[PDB]
Amino acid sequence: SHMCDAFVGTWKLVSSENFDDYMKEVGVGFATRKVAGMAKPNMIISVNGDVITIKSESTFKNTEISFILGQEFDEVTADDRKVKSTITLDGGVLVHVQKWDGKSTTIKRKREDDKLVVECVMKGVTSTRVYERA
């Protein structure tokens, strides 16, 4: 109970850095990178008991995951990878690992001031995406 309270709400993307290079490193193709890089998603996070739901709504795609911390699940990502995901809380940071085709990427979500900061890492490449309350 109360684990992710500071994450809950409706959030709007306000800045992005290095996302094209992150997407390249993940293997996303040209057209998807261009269209996806234009999107300004809203991220809606909610908690009901032990189940966390993260929805992303954008002009590119609407996605939704629900999960229990530490419990692996199947995810189809916005760029159409079929991945196996596990999300844990590490020192107040939501840590989301995706595995597919022998590859791995980690997405960290943390509260910093009034922002929700999303750090996406693939090998040596990091993208930082900043959300504010909608």
Ligand SMILES: CCn1c(S)nnc1CNc1ccccc1Cl
């Ligand atoms: C990385 C998390 N994320 C944030 S933050 N905004 N959208 C996403 C979903 N990922 C994604 C979206 C489009 C193309 C490629 C990818 Cl990997």
